[PDB]
Design a protein around this ligand. Structure first.
Ligand SMILES: [Mg+2]
Length: 1991
RNA sequence: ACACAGAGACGCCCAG
RNA sequence: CUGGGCGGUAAAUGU
RNA sequence: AAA
């Protein structure tokens, strides 16, 4: 029907109305039904509509014969949208548009139809249907639909002017129609007919949260893929296997037999492999092992030498660059031919070429060789190369073509063929690697060059001193001098000119040249000339070097450098080649060398400010780093990398021997470089040395240390940290390198090798159990047992209802997904049927498209929910029959990895399974890849459990594991069985089909690879894979994985890398749970039927795993038997691992005592080591961005990540200096002639996002972010004037200057003005935009409806707009193109200074022009920032000021060297936290004001107040969104939203590692340099005026927690508050102790008057507390949880509220709300939500009260009173207050009535708020307060130690009870004893005070004593536990920071004896002559003298 | 020179 | 043998 | 007293 006539026949009067319900009934007779054929599939449901039966009543004319399609998701609401088909205009609007904003929370609610009438009236009609036959049901539905809408519509119309609205509702059932809408009878009859058809079709076919749940549930209920088609298509995809796996139980007898067999096999391997039997001495055993290792190394060397040329002596250079080190000079080109050019030609073809090259340059035309500054200066304020063609004689061309400059044309002749045949040769191990050996130990790299006076050093020093102007202390000068000394060196200058050469080559990389011509160019500073012959930009580029040979002042020593040809006066070099990938390391060379020098000098103990000769060890590390960076080969990295695995075996304890000869499987391979031969020889020597003897464990007092550590490459013995960091030297290589076509055959070899052996019989692939499986089989019963064990664990931890919660979570996570979430920049494959066959796509080019294009078509098709697009993708995959995969290579710091790109439909299908697997993995207590908090929890908390259960002196045993081929080896049926086991039986079909689609993998190959492959039919070659591939492609031989003439490789086994990550993690978790259950079951038993006591902890990731087991022995013999038993248990795992599909790798290290590694984190007892070299190396991998500020912020992020790995602040400062040098070099330092003018002009105006580089304070360098440095710069230098002018123009006070104003604010609090234009990907990005076809006027459409940038959005055009603004994002879309960032940045930096390439935020101007415009600019504004502007711009400026004022306490380099702290743990230092007074968020405030949706929890009155404050800040703001755009200085709402969202405070948390732990002062004193203390010098006058409240908190803590009576405490509090001055309170909504202190001071001073008004104003109208408190529940080590039934009573916005709460165990919940007066309720709701989330209680728990009330409240959302859940909302003097002090609690208690206590404020001092600076401030004012009179005060009130006579007087006070004013007895003694005990434990002596069996789920031949002889005994060592759980317990004492008894213990230890004290605390023994002196300390210990027994 | 237990690049398209 | 015109790829799953 |  129509709506126009229906709305026209409605008369609307002024106001609101509801009409009267008109009950309608059927009148005309009804025909039966048209034909309604309905079928269901994955696409949808098809509704075939037949012909309506004919009748005279014209019923059925609305329908039309045909077919109707409905998607599966919305099949639940079929009656509603088919009975009411039509009659709706769609484009559903909300109440926010036509009605104004009321801020009631009901704005998000929208009706079905909303009609703006032709005369302006508003009519809203609501539809409702029901399958009932009673009139009462229709009346109930009508009343419900009336009442759920009447109240909010009334509230909306009782405010808007001239309201004329009408509300209607239509209820249609199968028995009648009830509606207030006047309708004709025929309309009712046709609606009845449509309802009958709708419910017939439904019977035949059968809040946003609830809608998503219903949609997902309906989809999974109606989804039915044909199982038979899957079984006919995919192998081993029968549901019978799944049903059998879920049906039959396990066979326990088979499990027992298999366990016994594998146990005896493991025992046999352990006994025979490690030479256990017969009896032998340990020395004999290690000698036999060493002989075996020597034999294996020798036969490997012989086998490697067999397939090689002999070639004992060979001439080659590992470094291609010459060792020249010339002095820098000016940029003046000088030929200066003195001996004549004639002496050059008669020295070879190189001499002829160089003579002919220099002769042309001698004949004028010097332009092009050196840039002209004049031309650049006149062009900028308003790339020419010197090409030449020499003679090129034929012999010269031949000799040059030998090097490969023109190798294609000169390929035929015999010399080039000989060279090509010789190139394919592998060098021999016996090559006499001699020069490399003595180059490392003896080199002159670290000798000072005495060059620190030239122009480059002058420029960098000028820039450094300009950057360090803000911080002008002595420390900065010392660190700058150290950096300059590092800069002045031979290696650094060599790297500088090498990097200049590399930048020049990268600039000249893309310059096409004709045949026979070259380019000559001179470097800017050094007198070095290069001749460049460039080929294609992707291909090689050639160069030769020439020097005067009279200007080479210095030269590096060593023979590793390549030979240089001498030609008379000039020295020349041959033609070498590089690519784009190899230029990365050459550019970043000087920064790399500076970082390495600083890092190793700091690590070797040399202080930065000292000057010493270099050590022998230092030169080895720096030379090795230099050689590795220069050679840049992939094979060289592996040898150094495997040193970690071959060296980790030295920690293995008895009875296992260290066997590093397992690593020979990867050391084999070709050796094409001399350096690789040297590294292999040193690796074998280290292997032999490791196999000879293990590492020595020395159990000293308490601590555990390892001895005999040494460096792998050079046999020098070092510390442990040096070895761990030397394990990672191989990371000094370019991670990304290009792949050539003769390569890439290794990938296909890795793919096909596993697939060759697949068991043909499928009986052991899930069908049945078997022992001793093959390379792919597994046992079903073991999987059943593991799944049952993990299910038992989950049911134990997460209760018995975990399955239903998991189902609801899965449905919620899958129901809310849109297509726009899936769209991203990730690539996808276009491989299809037409690409399969060759010889038809040979003359075509294959390309990969982004997922954005594939999702844009789906979005514009008309689907938005992800749950709608799964069916089409699944059907398309099933029809195609195979998953289609593309391949490429990802190069990493390790072995090569194959990466699988995936099709779009396959990705869409895989997303849901990945989501389900993640949801299942979120519950496991062992898995860590989805629970990142667990990896730092399981390892650290093992010590606590070991100490708590077993007791003190436990012995730990650990094992670290890995997997050979995790991606391969896994048959997908196992994963499917596990997932279906862990699911509630409704997802089973979908998971089974989505897994079964995997086993038809078809992987493409490169088309050029096949194009070169098809030409050749004979393979030759020495490897079988090439012959097999050639014969299979040509069809000569037949293989299963590839057929004739196809472009795809077909496999059947394995899962790809990462595609099924979470499912593999779940399987690994099941296996580890089974292992733990088996281990504890066997640990219950013991040797000879004993009972070994211990604890087993297990942790795992994707493939990595770790087992930690600790036991406690009582004697020696049982200790040795227990350790042998544990060795057996840890050795059986590698034989239990063939069961399932694990196949544990060779890199696993087993049976180590006090060490365990997991995810590259090494725990060595209480010393935690993290390799920081891997982060220091990666400190220059910046990303391409639109602005320079983003480059600086990326530098800051990399520096922070480097600091978090663990490094001193001096090292961080030096790394920041290196980053500054790198940035300034990237900004055209050595590529543009006008950089000197640029810096000389820039030093006047330092400006971030303009060219200047800000630098941090040396004391605190990495913790502070970029905003802190911006704030310091704005408050220190002239940047504040420009920022003030910019912000004033933003305010609108200063108008004009349309193009001068800055609007775009980059993330990080940096508003920007300009952006560079020239992007290489910009044309590609434009093409990408063209091929998707977005609307052009997206900004015009987004300004019309701005409410889509703040909501989820539902309209299709809304989604198109959101996608359009997603593509046009400034950062992500333009930056994720990626590539080799550094070479392209270098190439663009040759013209960035002087060329029009910057765009305003349309004239394009140079950087110098931008500097001139900024000169005629805000520099003339001359105004500073006011506190309002600073508070708006920096929302955390107070924390910045506090940190800065604390920071300047350290300004001088004075300190003492101390012993290094040997207890390293992690920490979480919180700083720069979110402000408490801000009370709101800008974006949330704007969203709530403009669109009325609940973002912030602020009431409408507070919203009005904050809006008035913001309007005071910004004048052009207004409630109407459209008014703000034109009035304000903004172009579009996108820019406004970006500007608003960018400037908002974010909390900054650092995670330092070091000694356990103001705290900033402690971490800046300890971590400045290891073994050194910074020793800050404080100023007295600062802390009293900066934070006087901290002194008050200190005094309050030391008074309340102290030995004082209550009256004395009251008087002390009164006088302390009277003496100090406290600022006035600030209004906050979050509870704070500072505000309570201010209120307490104002109350006791009585200055504010009515204290209740002040309290309610400070807490924003909130008053009250607990009338009946809640009884406490003792918590296991924490504050007592308040449980029971209680009441919260108070006032809130002039309303007498009363809240009833209840809780049980975990949290409290709302029970009942009683309120005095309704008035406005919404402010009450927001206030009570703030109270609830401040006190931690929840609203989700349902209430049992079913009685009558006014409204319901559930989940902090208002609900109609008809519904039954949620909390009911039923409506029901300053002289009385006083001071009351409880135990460590202050309260302003004021009882409401007699019989109960009513307190309204709280304050408990803690252990944090104690400062030594506050104690010193109290010491200066010792006579001011009353505490200076007696001895307990001035020592307990202040913080100081106790003197000898002082503690003697204290002891004689202790001996007698006496009576002293407010001093007390027996409690002062308690705190004294606690302080003395804590002081005792710090120095030593006194020790710090501190299951899923398998059954319910289901000898003595060795000498032992001899095989464990010669080993230390560990139970007699008394070694402590490790982990942060133990460490944090020892600091739990409240009086930890007390020095009141340290000197007492120092004096007592000497007089008593180190062993004597321990005997005293155990046996109570002492001798009399020292008893006379320890008797005062015996009364301090409160131990009687008659009890202690004398010796 | 680069890559590789010899699968490739060492310019490509034209026009005469 | 000359002469003219140039543009690529590179990017996978998760927190 | 605390999340
Ligand atoms: Mg592995």
């Amino acid at each position: 029907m129509n709506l126009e006539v229906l709305c026209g026949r409605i008369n609307v009067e002024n106001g609101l109305s509801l009409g009267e319900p008109g009950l309608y009934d059927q009148i005309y007779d009804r025909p039966g039904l048209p034909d309604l054929d309905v079928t269901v599939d994955a696409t949808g449901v098809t509704v075939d509509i037949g012909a309506v039966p004919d009748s005279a009543s014209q019923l059925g004319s609305s329908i039309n014969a045909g077919l109707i399609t409905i998607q599966l998701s919305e099949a639940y609401k079929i009656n509603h949208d088919f009975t009411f088909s039509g009659l709706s205009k769609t484009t559903d609007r909300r109440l926010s548009e036509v009605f104004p904003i009321t801020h009631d929370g009901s704005d998000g609610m929208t009706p079905a139809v909303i009609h703006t009438r032709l005369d302006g009236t508003i009519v809203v009609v609501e539809f409702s249907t029901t399958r009932s036959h009673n009139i009462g049901g229709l009346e109930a539905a009508y009343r419900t639909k009336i009442e759920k809408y009447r109240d909010p519509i009334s509230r909306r119309v009782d405010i808007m002017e001239n309201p004329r609205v009408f509300f209607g509702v239509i209820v249609v059932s199968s028995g009648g129609v009830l509606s207030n809408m006047p309708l004709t009878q025929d309309e009712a009859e046709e609606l009845m007919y449509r309802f009958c058809i709708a419910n017939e079709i439904y019977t035949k076919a059968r809040e946003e949260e609830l809608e998503a749940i219903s949609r997902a549930l309906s989809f999974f209920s109606l989804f039915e893929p044909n199982i038979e088609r899957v079984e006919g298509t995919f192998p081993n995809s029968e549901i019978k296997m799944l049903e059998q796996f879920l049906s039959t139980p396990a066979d326990v007898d088979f499990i027992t037999k298999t366990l016994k067999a594998k146990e005896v096999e493991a025992y046999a391997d352990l006994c025979d492999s490690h030479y256990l039997k017969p009896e032998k001495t340990i020395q004999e055993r290690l000698e036999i092992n060493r002989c075996e290792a020597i034999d294996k190394t020798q036969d490997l060397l012989a086998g490697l030498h067999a397939r090689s040329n002999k070639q004992t002596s060979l001439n080659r250079g590992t470094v291609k660059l010459p060792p020249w080190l010339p002095k820098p000079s000016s940029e003046s080109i000088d030929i200066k031919t003195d001996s004549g050019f004639g002496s050059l030609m008669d020295h070879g073809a190189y001499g002829e070429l160089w003579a002919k090259c220099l002769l042309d340059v001698s004949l004028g035309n010097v332009e092009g060789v050196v840039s002209d500054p004049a031309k650049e200066l006149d062009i900028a304020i308003s790339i020419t190369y010197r090409r030449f063609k020499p003679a090129l004689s034929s012999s010269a061309r031949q000799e040059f073509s030998l090097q490969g400059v023109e190798g294609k044309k000169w390929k035929r002749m015999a010399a080039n063929q000989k060279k090509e045949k010789e190139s394919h040769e592998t060098l021999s191990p016996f090559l006499d690697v001699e020069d490399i050996g003595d180059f490392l130990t003896f080199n002159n790299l670290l000798t000072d060059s005495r060059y620190g006076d030239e122009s480059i050093q002058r420029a960098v020093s000028i820039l450094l001193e300009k950057a360090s102007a803000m911080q002008d202390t002595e420390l900065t000068h010392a660190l700058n001098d150290s950096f300059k000394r590092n800069l002045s060196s031979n290696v650094v200058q060599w790297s500088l000119w090498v990097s200049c050469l590399a930048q020049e080559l990268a600039s000249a990389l893309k310059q096409h040249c004709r045949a026979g011509e070259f380019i000559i160019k001179k470097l800017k500073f050094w007198p070095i000339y290069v001749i460049i012959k460039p080929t294609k930009s992707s291909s090689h580029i050639f160069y030769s070097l020439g020097i005067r040979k009279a200007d080479v002042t210095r030269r590096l020593t060593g023979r590793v450098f390549s030979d240089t040809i001498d030609a008379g006066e000039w020295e020349l070099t041959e033609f070498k080649s590089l690519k784009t990938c190899k230029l990365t390391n050459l550019v970043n060379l000087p920064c790399t060398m500076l970082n390495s020098i600083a890092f190793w000098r700091e690590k070797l103990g040399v202080a930065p400010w000292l000057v010493r000769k270099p050590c022998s060890e230092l030169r080895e590390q720096v030379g090795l780093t230099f050689l590795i960076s220069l050679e840049d080969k992939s094979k060289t990295e592996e040898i150094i990398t495997l040193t970690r695995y071959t060296q980790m075996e030295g920690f293995v304890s008895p009875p296992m021997l260290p066997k590093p000869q397992k690593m020979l499987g990867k050391l084999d391979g070709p050796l094409r470089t001399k350096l690789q031969v040297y590294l292999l020889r040193k690796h074998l020597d280290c292997m032999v040395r490791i196999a000879s003897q293990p590492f020595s464990l020395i159990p000293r007092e308490g601590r555990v240390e390892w001895g005999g550590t040494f460096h792998a490459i050079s046999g020098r013995s070092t510390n442990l940290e040096n070895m761990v960091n030397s394990w990672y030297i191989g990371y000094y290589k370019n991670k990304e390198e290009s792949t050539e076509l003769n390569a890439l055959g290794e990938m296909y070899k890795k793919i096909v090798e596993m697939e060759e052996d697949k068991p043909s019989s499928p009986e052991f692939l899930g069908w049945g159990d078997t022992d001793s499986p093959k390379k792919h089989e597994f046992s079903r019963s073991f999987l059943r047992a593991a799944c049952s064990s993990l299910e038992r664990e989950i049911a134990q931890r997460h209760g018995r209802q975990w399955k239903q919660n998991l189902e609801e979570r899965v449905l919620r996570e899958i129901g809310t997904k849109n297509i726009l979430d899936l769209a991203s920049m990730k690539a996808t494959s276009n491989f299809s049927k037409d690409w399969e066959l060759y010889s038809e796509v040979q003359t075509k080019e294959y390309h990969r498209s982004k997922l954005l294009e594939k999702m844009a078509t789906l979005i514009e098709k008309g689907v938005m929910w992800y749950i709608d697009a799964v069916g089409q993708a699944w059907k398309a995959v099933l029809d195609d029959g195979c998953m289609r995969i593309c391949l490429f290579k990802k190069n990493q710091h390790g072995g090569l990895r194959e990466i699988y790109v995936m099709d779009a439909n396959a990705r869409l299908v895989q997303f849901g399974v990945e989501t389900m697997a993640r949801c299942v993995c979120e519950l496991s207590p062992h898995e860590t890849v989805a629970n990142p908090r667990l990896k730092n929890s399981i390892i650290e908390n093992h010590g606590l459990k070991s100490a708590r259960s077993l007791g003190p002196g436990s012995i730990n045993i650990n094992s670290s594991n890995d997997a050979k081929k995790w991606n391969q080896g896994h048959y997908t049926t196992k994963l499917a069985l596990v997932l279906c086991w862990f699911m509630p039986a409704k997802f089973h079909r979908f998971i089974w089909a989505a897994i079964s689609m995997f086993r038809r993998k078809k992987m493409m190959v490169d088309l050029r690879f096949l194009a070169h492959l098809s030409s050749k039919s004979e393979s030759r070659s020495s490897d079988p894979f090439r012959e097999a591939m050639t014969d299979a492609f040509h069809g000569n031989r037949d293989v299963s994985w590839m057929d004739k003439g196809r472009t795809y490789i077909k496999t059947e086994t394995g899962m790809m890398q990462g595609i099924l990550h979470f499912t593999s993690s779940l399987l690994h978790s099941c296996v580890q749970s089974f292992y733990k259950s088996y281990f504890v079951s066997k640990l219950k038993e013991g040797y000879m039927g004993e009972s070994i006591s211990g604890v087993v902890d297990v942790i795992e990731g994707s493939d990595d795993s770790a087992i930690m087991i600790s036991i406690r022995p009582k004697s020696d013999m049982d200790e040795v038997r227990s350790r042998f038993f544990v060795a057996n248990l840890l050795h059986s795992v590698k034989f239990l691992n063939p069961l399932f599909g694990i196949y544990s790798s060779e890199k696993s290290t087993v049976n180590t005592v006090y060490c365990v590694e997991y995810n590259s984190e090494f725990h060595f007892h209480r010393h935690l080591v993290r390799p920081t070299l891997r982060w220091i190396a990666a400190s220059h991998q910046i990303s391409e961005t639109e602005a320079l500020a983003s480059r600086q912020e990326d530098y800051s992020n990399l520096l922070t990540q480097c600091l978090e790995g663990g490094a001193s602040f001096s090292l961080t400062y030096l790394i920041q200096c290196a980053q500054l040098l790198h940035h300034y070099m990237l900004l055209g330092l050595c590529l543009h002639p006008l950089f000197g003018t640029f810096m000389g002009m820039l030093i006047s105006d330092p400006d971030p996002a303009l060219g200047f580089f800000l630098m941090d304070n040396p004391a605190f360098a990495g913790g502070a972010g970029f905003r802190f440095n911006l704030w310091r710069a704005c408050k220190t230098t002239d940047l504040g004037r420009k920022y003030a002018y910019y912000f004033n123009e933003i305010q609108g006070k200063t108008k004009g200057d349309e193009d001068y104003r800055a609007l775009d604010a980059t993330s990080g609090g940096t508003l920007s003005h300009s952006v560079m234009v020239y992007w290489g990907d910009r044309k590609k990005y434009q093409a990408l935009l063209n091929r998707m076809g977005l609307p052009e006027d997206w900004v015009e459409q987004i300004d019309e409806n701005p409410g889509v940038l703040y909501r989820r959005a539902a309209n299709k055009k809304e989604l198109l707009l959101k996608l359009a603004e997603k593509v046009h994002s400034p950062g992500v879309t333009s930056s994720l193109s990626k590539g080799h960032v550094v070479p392209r940045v270098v190439a663009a930096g040759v013209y960035l200074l002087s060329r029009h390439c910057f765009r305003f935020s349309t004239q394009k101007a140079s950087l110098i022009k931008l500097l001139m415009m900024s000169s005629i600019s805000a520099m003339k504004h001359g105004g500073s920032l006011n506190p309002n502007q600073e508070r708006m711009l920096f929302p955390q400026a107070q924390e910045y000021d506090r940190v800065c004022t604390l920071l300047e306490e350290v300004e001088h380099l004075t300190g003492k060297f101390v012993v290094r702290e040997r207890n390293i743990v992690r920490s979480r230092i919180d700083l720069f936290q979110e402000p408490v007074d801000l009370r709101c968020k800008a974006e949330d405030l704007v969203s709530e004001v403009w669109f009325g949706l609940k973002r912030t929890k602020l009431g409408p009155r507070l919203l009005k107040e904050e809006w008035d404050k913001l309007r005071a800040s910004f004048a052009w703001l207004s409630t109407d969104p459209s008014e703000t755009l034109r009035d304000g200085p903004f172009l579009s709402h996108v820019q406004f939203r970006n500007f608003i969202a960018h400037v908002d405070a974010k909390s900054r948390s650092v995670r330092l590692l070091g000694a356990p732990v103001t705290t900033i002062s402690q971490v800046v004193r300890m971590n400045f340099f290891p073994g050194f203390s910074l020793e800050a010098e404080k100023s007295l006058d600062n802390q009293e005026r900066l934070e006087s409240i901290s002194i008050l908190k200190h005094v309050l803590f030391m008074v309340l927690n102290g030995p004082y009576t209550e009256e004395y405490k009251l008087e002390m509090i009164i006088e302390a508050f009277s003496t100090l001055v406290i600022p006035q309170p600030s209004e906050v909504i979050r509870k704070s102790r500072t505000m309570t202190l201010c209120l307490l001071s104002n109350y006791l001073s009585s200055r504010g008057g009515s204290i209740l008004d002040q309290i309610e104003r400070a807490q924003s109208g909130t008053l009250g507390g607990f009338s009946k408190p809640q009884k406490t529940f003792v918590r296991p080590g924490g504050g007592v949880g308040y449980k029971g039934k209680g009441v919260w009573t108070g006032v809130m916005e002039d309303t007498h509220v009363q809240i009833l709460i209840d809780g049980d165990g975990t949290s409290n919940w709302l029970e009942e709300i009683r309120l005095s007066s309704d008035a406005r309720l919404y402010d009450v709701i927001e206030s009570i939500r703030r109270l609830c989330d401040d006190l931690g209680i929840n609203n989700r728990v349902a209430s049992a009260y079913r009685g009558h009330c006014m409204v319901r409240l559930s989940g902090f959302k208002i609900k109609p009173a008809s519904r039954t859940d949620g909390c009911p909302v039923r409506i029901m003097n300053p002289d009385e207050v006083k001071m009351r002090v409880r135990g460590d609690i202050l309260n302003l208690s004021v009882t409401i009535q007699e019989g109960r206590v009513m307190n309204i404020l709280s304050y408990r001092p803690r252990d944090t708020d104690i400062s030594e600076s506050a104690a010193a401030y109290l010491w200066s004012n010792r006579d001011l307060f009353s505490f200076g009179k007696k001895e307990p005060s001035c020592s307990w009130i202040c913080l100081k130690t106790l003197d000898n006579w002082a503690w003697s007087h204290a002891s004689v006070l202790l001996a007698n009870d006496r009576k002293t004013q407010g001093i007390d007895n027996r409690a002062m003694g308690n705190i004294f004893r606690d302080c003395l005990e804590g002081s005792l434990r710090k120095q030593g002596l006194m020790r710090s005070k501190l299951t899923q069996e398998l059954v319910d789920i289901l000898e003595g031949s060795l000498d032992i004593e001899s095989i464990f002889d010669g080993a230390p005994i560990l139970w007699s060592a008394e070694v402590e536990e490790f982990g942060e759980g133990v460490v944090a317990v020892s600091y739990s004492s409240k009086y930890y920071h007390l020095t009141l008894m340290d000197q007492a213990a120092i004096t007592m230890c000497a007089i008593m004896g180190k062993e004597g004290c321990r005997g005293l605390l155990t046996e109570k023994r002492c001798m009399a002559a020292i008893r006379e002196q320890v008797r005062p300390f015996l009364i301090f210990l409160q131990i009687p003298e008659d009890s202690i027994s004398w010796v």
